[PDB]
Design a binder for this molecule. Structure first.
Ligand SMILES: O=P(O)(O)O[C@@H]1[C@@H](OP(=O)(O)O)[C@@H](OP(=O)(O)O)[C@@H](O)[C@H](OP(=O)(O)O)[C@H]1OP(=O)(O)O
Ligand SMILES: Nc1ncnc2c1ncn2[C@@H]1O[C@H](COP(=O)(O)OP(=O)(O)O)[C@@H](O)[C@H]1O
Ligand SMILES: [Mg+2]
Length: 217
């Protein structure tokens, strides 16, 4: 019995693993994603441990990846592309929200270019599922800011172009647990400097989330 994994975005074949806590992702165009996990493992092991789901193995053209939603009763997931898009410019300036849990209920369209005001409204839409205890939703926002802060810092010292990578924001309905990790290395490339487009995406999100944690309404 093959069980299809409930993606929030993208074109890739992702099924639940035969086993608890794993998803399998088909590398469709090349094994570049595998080359890149293994390169980050050699040269930036600390970055891998803190910010990337664990790669457990490869089976032909499938990566056996840590399921980021596994320890969640009621996960809310949001995919934000922070790396360069292939051709298009970003739908929210420095980044592109690709989807989120219940996005359909707020007539979210991934092809729509958004104002600052609309971008913030879509992130606020993503947080509705967390209920109205604004104390525990601030805690979710702050714990995301804590890890994005460190990621923006660490990214200055990493000589990769993160073309096409996303942040996966997760929080539980009861707001008791949350996390953000970096995924989708299939178009990442080696370069001789750091990636300022990707750092500006993260710093922008940190700005947006800070505004929400401080906003007193
Ligand atoms: O966002 P870019 O421009 O890079 O390409 C995107 C592409 O978007 P498009 O070429 O703008 O239509 C997406 O197609 P849909 O939006 O699902 O129709 C695709 O599904 C990957 O989007 P996701 O990363 O959201 O899947 C891909 O990205 P990649 O993995 O870099 O080939
Ligand atoms: N390790 C993971 N744990 C949980 N969900 C994941 C994981 N990796 C990817 N996903 C889900 O799959 C979607 C797309 O994955 P991604 O790596 O961006 O692949 P693609 O190359 O198809 O865009 C994300 O929006 C997310 O919901
Ligand atoms: Mg992707």
């Amino acid at each position: 019995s093959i069980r299809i994994f409930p993606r929030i975005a993208g074109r890739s074949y992702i099924i639940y693993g035969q086993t608890s806590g794993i998803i399998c992702k088909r590398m469709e165009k090349s094994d570049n994603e595998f080359v890149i996990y293994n390169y980050i493992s050699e040269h930036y092991d600390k970055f891998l441990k803190k910010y990337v789901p664990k790669l457990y193995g490869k089976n032909n053209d499938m990566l056996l990846l840590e399921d980021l939603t596994y320890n969640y009763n009621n996960p809310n997931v949001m995919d934000v592309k922070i790396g360069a898009r292939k051709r298009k410019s970003h739908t929210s300036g420095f980044f592109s929200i690709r989807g989120y849990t219940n996005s359909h209920d707020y007539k979210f369209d991934p092809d729509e270019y958004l104002t600052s005001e609309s971008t913030i409204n879509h992130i606020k839409n993503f947080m509705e599922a967390g209920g109205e205890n604004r104390d525990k939703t601030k805690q979710v926002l702050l714990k995301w800011i804590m890890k994005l802060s460190e990621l923006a810092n660490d990214l200055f010292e990493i000589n990769l172009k993160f073309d096409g990578v996303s942040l996966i924001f997760i929080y539980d309905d009861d707001c008791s647990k949350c996390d953000v990790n970096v995924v989708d290395f299939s178009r990442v490339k080696l370069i001789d400097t750091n990636d300022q487009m990707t750092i500006s995406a993260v710093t922008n999100l940190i700005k947006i989330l800070s505004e929400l944690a401080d906003n007193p309404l």
